[PDB]
Ligand binder design. Sequence first.
Ligand SMILES: C[C@H](NC(=O)c1cc2c(=O)[n+]3ccccc3[nH]c2[n+](Cc2ccccc2)c1N)c1ccccc1
Length: 370
Amino acid sequence: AKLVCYFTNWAQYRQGEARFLPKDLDPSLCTHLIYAFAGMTNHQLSTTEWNDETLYQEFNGLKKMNPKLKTLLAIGGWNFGTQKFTDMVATANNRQTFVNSAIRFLRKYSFDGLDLDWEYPGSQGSPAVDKERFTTLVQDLANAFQQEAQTSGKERLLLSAAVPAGQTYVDAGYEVDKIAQNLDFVNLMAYDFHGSWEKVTGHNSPLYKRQEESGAAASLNVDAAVQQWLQKGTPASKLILGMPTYGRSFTLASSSDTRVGAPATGSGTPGPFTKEGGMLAYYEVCSWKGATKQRIQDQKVPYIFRDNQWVGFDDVESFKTKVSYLKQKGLGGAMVWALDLDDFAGFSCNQGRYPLIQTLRQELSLPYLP
Ligand SMILES: C[C@H](NC(=O)c1cc2c(=O)[n+]3ccccc3[nH]c2[n+](Cc2ccccc2)c1N)c1ccccc1
């Protein structure tokens, strides 16, 4: 089984005990660490933070402590948008420029592979032609990684992709059966199912549908998303189930209606550390004074509220339920967004360091590597 964990290169700017920096990485917590994010300049892979080269050295230096750890660099992300991806895949020459730059870049900084986080081909402004061009880009990278392994005699660079769970995004940009053959593994973003872009409360990452749901809404859950990618042609062993160590927050229309599906007026108040309206880290909801925790019986996940603030999140119990689920399905493992949103320092939840990700590790019965 795999435990794929995302590091974010902006967590270093959080204040106080929420600041995430080199020393906070555990070299044996996960099997694969993915560095978010790289960017693109003139169709070539490039850094996005002033000290990325310093962090790369720290990041990939973990492999000196755990030689079996694999590291990947993720390009893209939500805020990156789509225009640079669209321009790069528009021509064979631009794709070749990108592919060659990626191989040199990964080898130079000692990454073991590349994680494609284009969000998304065919959506977020990207034209419909990008669906097939994304298939071609995945093929170009896979084939070029294979060729580089042969000419260099080194171990082949890995290729993964972070993929959406909602059907409108999948059908707009993903030839699932084709790309699954060329990807080493598929990181299913089984979160952001609901959020403050909607006018009623809903859970970030529900495992199952609610009984009252219908239509397209009844597919906005983990089980439906997994079945979607499996039925569309992803081998179970390549499908890695994403897990959130954060929640999605709402400002309720009235403190007297705290139901799942209650009217919301907008995003929840920004957290004291993450400072991003609409989301909260696990350590910002696990010891929230005065709040009331609840569980969604149909969906097997908690929510919590205080006054006009409503947050759906994941706890140790829901992570355990989700792992038991993935095991029943025969999936390749779990993926986590993100290291810095768990209680990585153990300063808030009184559950030790990395309580959520240690739960995944234990439930997946991953080997204790020295
Ligand atoms: C990776 C993850 N997710 C986003 O980065 C993100 C994902 C969506 C989204 O799926 N999504 C789906 C459907 C419709 C809109 C929408 N918008 C999104 N916004 C923008 C956004 C807008 C309004 C309120 C909150 C967030 C986002 N930043 C994340 C990153 C950092 C910290 C926690 C979690």
